[PDB]
Amino acid sequence: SSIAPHPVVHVALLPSAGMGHLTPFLRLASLLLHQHCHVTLITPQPTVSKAEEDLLSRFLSAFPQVNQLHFHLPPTDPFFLQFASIRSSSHLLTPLLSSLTPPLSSFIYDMTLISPLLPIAESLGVPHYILFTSSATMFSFFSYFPTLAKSESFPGKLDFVEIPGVSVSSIPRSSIPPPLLVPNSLFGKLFMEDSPKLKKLHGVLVNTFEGIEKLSLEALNGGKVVKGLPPVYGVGPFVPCEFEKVETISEWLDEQPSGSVVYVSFGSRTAMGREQLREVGDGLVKSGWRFLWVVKDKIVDRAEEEGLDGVLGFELVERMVKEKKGLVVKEWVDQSEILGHKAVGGFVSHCGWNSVVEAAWFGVKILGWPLHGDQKINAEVVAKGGWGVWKEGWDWEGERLVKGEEIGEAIREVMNDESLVMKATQVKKDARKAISVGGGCEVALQKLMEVWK
Numbered sequence: 001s002s003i004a005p006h007p008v009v010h011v012a013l014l015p016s017a018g019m020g021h022l023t024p025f026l027r028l029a030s031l032l033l034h035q036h037c038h039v040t041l042i043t044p045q046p047t048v049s050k051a052e053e054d055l056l057s058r059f060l061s062a063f064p065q066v067n068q069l070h071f072h073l074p075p076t077d078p079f080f081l082q083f084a085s086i087r088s089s090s091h092l093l094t095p096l097l098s099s100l101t102p103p104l105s106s107f108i109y110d111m112t113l114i115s116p117l118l119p120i121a122e123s124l125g126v127p128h129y130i131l132f133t134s135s136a137t138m139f140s141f142f143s144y145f146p147t148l149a150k151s152e153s154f155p156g157k158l159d160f161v162e163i164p165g166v167s168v169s170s171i172p173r174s175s176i177p178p179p180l181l182v183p184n185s186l187f188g189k190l191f192m193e194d195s196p197k198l199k200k201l202h203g204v205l206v207n208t209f210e211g212i213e214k215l216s217l218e219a220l221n222g223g224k225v226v227k228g229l230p231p232v233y234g235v236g237p238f239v240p241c242e243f244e245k246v247e248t249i250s251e252w253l254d255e256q257p258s259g260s261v262v263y264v265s266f267g268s269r270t271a272m273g274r275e276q277l278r279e280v281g282d283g284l285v286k287s288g289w290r291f292l293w294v295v296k297d298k299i300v301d302r303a304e305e306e307g308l309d310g311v312l313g314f315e316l317v318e319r320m321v322k323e324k325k326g327l328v329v330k331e332w333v334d335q336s337e338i339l340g341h342k343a344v345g346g347f348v349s350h351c352g353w354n355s356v357v358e359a360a361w362f363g364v365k366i367l368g369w370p371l372h373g374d375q376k377i378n379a380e381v382v383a384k385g386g387w388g389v390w391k392e393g394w395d396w397e398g399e400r401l402v403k404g405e406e407i408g409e410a411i412r413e414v415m416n417d418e419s420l421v422m423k424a425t426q427v428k429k430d431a432r433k434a435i436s437v438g439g440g441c442e443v444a445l446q447k448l449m450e451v452w453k
């Protein structure tokens with residue numbers, strides 16, 4: 001008895017600094033657009049890196065129906081500095097969010113912004129959420145932090161973190177993210193201020209799935225970690241999207257035998273010291289395997305200033321050009337196009353979380369080389385599933401010099417192991433189940449959409 005336009009579900013999104021935060025937010029935006037949502041994207045500007053700038057430009061051109069709200073920031077690790085700048089200025093956003101049309105339905109923001117955005121979301125009167133961009137196991141640690149910090153000996157006497165029922169049952173002190181043991185650090189301060197406020201959220205979205213973190217997901221939603229935690233929605237794996245693409249790399253890969261290439265990358269914001277970097281190349285040559293090595297000499301891509309031949313040195317460059325087995329680049333690559341190529345049989349990775357979930361989506365086994373932060377916990381999430389391995393004696397980047405001899409031996413050990421491929425293929429199979437009807441991601445998004453309507 002009526003011919004009416006259907007009311008629109010309008011979601012607002014706010015990502016913080018780095019490609020490891022921007023990429024999952026934009027993949028979530030694509031998922032929401034395919035559910036016929038209207039999306040507003042708040043963009044803090046300028047970005048720390050050029051790669052962030054360029055990805056946003058390709059996203060907006062692909063989806064002109066997205067409403068961009070500019071967030072011009074006022075004028076240490078450059079990405080951590082941006083985390084603090086966005087957090088300290090977020091209290092100014094209220095006028096831009098309260099005048100949104102059509103009426104806002106929900107608000108999903110970065111995990112590092114809980115405290116300043118909670119009163120803003122309360123005034124908007126809509127359900128609000130964090131998108132947590134690391135593993136569900138690390139989210140359990142974050143939620144558990146007030147339980148550990150109440151002790152009078154914290155953080156001096158803490159040898160094991162054992163959260164009931166999660167995917168990594170015992171986290172030793174050597175795997176705790178170093179800033180969490182330093183009360184005055186940025187993340188140590190954010191953990192203490194923000195974790196007690198998790199109970200005010202409507203929910204927590206995580207880019208993960210039952211095939212890789214079954215136990216952590218069940219413990220978080222069973223009241224085992226902390227009583228009164230908001231529900232945790234496993235909405236991963238986030239499938240890589242078309243707008244991310246920017247041809248000699250793909251042409252080189254086309255000429256290599258299937259499964260014969262080892263891909264090497266330590267993410268978008270980490271650069272090894274020059275001596276350690278040169279040991280990586282020595283290990284790749286000694287391994288005897290074909291390789292595609294992505295190099296960074298600076299944390300921030302904008303700051304690169306020396307050519308690859310000067311970074312690598314004459315002796316290493318000469319060895320690699322003579323053997324004619326490897327390709328080395330110091331530029332932004334299409335990592336998902338590489339991991340999805342049939343030539344790539346293994347992945348030497350720092351185990352940043354987006355890279356882990358991409359490797360799971362493509363069924364590529366991992367040699368884990370965790371370098372900083374939560375990467376040792378993520379490396380063990382992978383090892384528990386039997387589709388990758390890591391050497392706990394290598395330690396955080398810069399604590400010791402890992403030698404080319406032992407790097408080459410570790411590469412041969414992973415590439416000769418067919419059991420790792422067997423488990424990685426089953427992970428790949430469970431990754432597709434999660435997004436199909438009845439899978440964890442499909443079930444979670446339907447729950448959220450019905451609430452927002």
Ligand SMILES: O=C(CCc1ccc(O)cc1)c1c(O)cc(O)c([C@@H]2O[C@H](CO)[C@@H](O)[C@H](O)[C@H]2O)c1O
Binds near residue numbers: 020079080112373
């Ligand atoms: O516990 C986490 C993640 C959970 C969290 C929760 C609330 C919060 O307020 C901050 C973090 C974490 C850490 O304790 C140290 C650290 O160094 C990184 C690293 O964060 C950088 C960002 O730039 C990534 O690039 C890198 O991959 C990742 O390992 C972390 O994720």
Ligand SMILES: O=c1ccn([C@@H]2O[C@H](COP(=O)(O)OP(=O)(O)O)[C@@H](O)[C@H]2O)c(=O)[nH]1
Binds near residue numbers: 023269270333354
């Ligand atoms: O040359 C590069 C380097 C990185 N990435 C992507 O950048 C992200 C890195 O995020 P992750 O959580 O793995 O680690 P972080 O870079 O934050 O340490 C992933 O989506 C990678 O696929 C890419 O496409 N090309």
